[PDB]
Amino acid sequence: SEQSICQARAAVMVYDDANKKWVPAGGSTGFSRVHIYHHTGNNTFRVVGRKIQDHQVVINCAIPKGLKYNQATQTFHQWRDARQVYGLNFGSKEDANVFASAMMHALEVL
Ligand SMILES: CC(=O)N[C@@H](Cc1ccccc1Cl)C(=O)N1CC[C@@H]2C=C[C@H]3CC[C@@H](C(=O)N4CC[C@@H]5C=C[C@H]6CC[C@@H](C(=O)O)N6C(=O)[C@H]54)N3C(=O)[C@H]21
């Protein structure tokens, strides 16, 4: 019942609080295809990203109502979760814009 509403090419990262540095999500360096999925049954949204080369899922995160999405630069956006900060380092400004527009839309309708 999940349907993709966008896809963007980005390096998915998480902030390692213990070592005070960004690290590749899933320990897997390289680019992912990152979607927002809309579950129409319960009007929920999630971020799901899979490595482009090997298809491993490296991020699967809820988008709750009120999520604060920080566009730090034209190609790096980030948001908080209880466990860690997530980051998307986009391949292009246009990838970043298409993803942010889909995120904005999800946040407006939640
Ligand atoms: C008030 C508050 O806690 N605010 C949070 C942000 C926030 C605000 C509102 C809602 C949600 C969130 Cl999430 C916060 O300040 N956080 C999130 C944790 C992040 C960590 C470190 C420092 C290092 C300085 C900055 C940083 O990360 N920045 C600069 C752009 C820069 C661009 C790309 C990424 C790519 C990986 C790394 C690099 O290239 O080496 N890198 C970067 O180096 C990237 N920052 C942050 O950004 C920090």
From Swiss-Prot:
Residues 1-110 form the WH1 domain. Expressed in myoepithelia of parotid, breast, bronchial glands and sweat glands. Expressed in colon-rectum muscolaris mucosae epithelium, pancreas acinar ductal epithelium, endometrium epithelium, prostate fibromuscolar stroma and placenta vascular media. Overexpressed in a majority of breast cancer cell lines and primary breast tumor lesions. It is found in: Cytoplasm; Cytoplasm, Cytoskeleton; Cell projection, Lamellipodium; Cell projection, Filopodium. Required to transform actin polymerization into active movement for the propulsive force of Listeria monocytogenes. Ena/VASP proteins are actin-associated proteins involved in a range of processes dependent on cytoskeleton remodeling and cell polarity such as axon guidance and lamellipodial and filopodial dynamics in migrating cells. ENAH induces the formation of F-actin rich outgrowths in fibroblasts. Acts synergistically with BAIAP2-alpha and downstream of NTN1 to promote filipodia formation. Belongs to the Ena/VASP family. The EVH2 domain is comprised of 3 regions. Block A is a thymosin-like domain required for G-actin binding. The KLKR motif within this block is essential for the G-actin binding and for actin polymerization. Block B is required for F-actin binding and subcellular location, and Block C for tetramerization. Homotetramer. Interacts with APBB1IP, APBB1, PFN1 and ROBO4. Isoforms, containing the polyproline-rich regions with PPLP motifs, bind the WW domain of APBB1IP. Isoforms, containing the PPSY motif, bind, in vitro, to the WW2 and WW3 domains of NEDD4 and to the WW1 domain of YAP1. Binds the SH3 domain of BAIAP2-alpha but only after the autoinhibitory region of BAIAP2-alpha has been blocked by interaction with CDC42. Interacts, via the EVH1/WH1 domain, with the Pro-rich domains from VCL, ZYX and Listeria monocytogenes actA and with TES (via LIM domains). This is Protein enabled homolog. The chain holds residues 2 to 111 of 591 of the full protein.
